[PDB]
Design an enzyme around this catalytic site. Structure first.
Site, PDB file in Angstrom:
ATOM      1  N   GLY A  18       2.668   3.720   8.182  1.00 49.67           N
ATOM      2  CA  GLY A  18       3.445   2.657   7.776  1.00 49.67           C
ATOM      3  C   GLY A  18       4.320   2.606   6.422  1.00 49.67           C
ATOM      4  O   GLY A  18       5.382   2.512   5.999  1.00 49.67           O
ATOM      5  N   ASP A  19       3.149   2.850   5.544  1.00 51.69           N
ATOM      6  CA  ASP A  19       3.475   3.088   3.940  1.00 51.69           C
ATOM      7  C   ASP A  19       2.731   3.995   3.374  1.00 51.69           C
ATOM      8  O   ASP A  19       2.930   4.030   2.174  1.00 51.69           O
ATOM      9  CB  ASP A  19       3.255   1.618   3.473  1.00 51.69           C
ATOM     10  CG  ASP A  19       4.645   0.863   2.890  1.00 51.69           C
ATOM     11  OD1 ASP A  19       5.578   1.630   3.030  1.00 51.69           O
ATOM     12  OD2 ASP A  19       4.608  -0.201   2.546  1.00 51.69           O
TER      13      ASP A  19
END
EC number: 3.1.-.-
Lengths: 152, 153
Positions: A18-19
């Site tokens: 995701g990040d």
DNA sequence: TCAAAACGTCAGCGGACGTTTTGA
DNA sequence: TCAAAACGTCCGCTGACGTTTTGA
């Protein structure tokens, strides 16, 4: 070689998908034999008020450190041995950044032989290009072609 | 309801902690008895070139849908029941967005009784304030103090 | 009168590089 | 002549809202 709890790996995989950021660079540096340094980084960012989460990551993963750069802080992991051990365990679970992760593992295992032949070095810089093209490269300046020149 | 495996919930919790938004709103709308809608939205964003991941996710999560806005695409989950079920199962594994998630779970549960009395409604609107406070809120307009002033007439 | 979809907006980022130095 | 650290910085978003419309 710390082996991670599988539950922690699944979580981290999701978080990294995701990040997470997997960065490969060729850095112009006149002190090296081929005039550039091969550099690998894994990185996550968090607004500085929530850097308490990055600091716990330093503990959980057991390696790397935390950079403050104003409004945001970074978890950073550059050490090639820890990084290799880390991505090796995380790779199988990755869904989005698995390609970058494979390229990094491949680059790391070939570092020894890349530093002996300008040919092997250049093939390794093309792997760095593939990582950069899989990311959202905006400001990249040094490429394998930058190194194909220079080596002449 | 859908039961999710633990492996899926672990991965997703990390994903959501890293890159997911839990959004609660009080939307001014004259057609509602209290002149406002309570809106809850779970949202993920990807560059459109990587839609396939959100598309895949609709399939895996079994609910929600994907909206292309141009350069970016959103996975969106706004249906209340599906969202309750999803967050209830995900809440235990959250480490960064856990507080937002709890708040959301509470709101949902008090919705049936919030429609019946403006007092409980105004109360539910403060839990919404707490979600926006945990997020990086910047352009918010309708708070519980707005709804308080509107219900006074 | 609601739940849900549909779509508009935009400024503080932050993912992803860069350059230089340290310390072997 | 290296590995890593330390620090600088751009630009395309994108998180988190907004308003409005649809269908029962």
């Amino acid at each position: 070689n710390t082996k991670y709890n599988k539950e922690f790996l699944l979580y981290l995989a999701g978080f990294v998908d995701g990040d997470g950021s997997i960065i490969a660079q060729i850095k112009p540096n006149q002190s090296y034999k081929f005039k550039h340094q091969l550099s690998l980084t894994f990185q996550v960012t968090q607004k500085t008020q929530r850097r308490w989460f990055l600091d716990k990551l330093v503990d959980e993963i057991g390696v790397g450190y935390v950079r403050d750069r104003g409004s945001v802080s970074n978890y950073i992991l550059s050490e090639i041995k820890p990084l290799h051990n880390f991505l090796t365990q995380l790779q199988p679970f990755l869904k989005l950044k698995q390609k970058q992760a494979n390229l990094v593992l491949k680059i790391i295992e070939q570092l020894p032989s890349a530093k002996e032949s300008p040919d092997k070095f250049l093939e390794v810089c093309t792997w760095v290009d593939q990582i950069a093209a899989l990311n959202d490269s905006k400001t990249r300046k040094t490429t394998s072609e930058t190194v194909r020149a220079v080596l002449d």
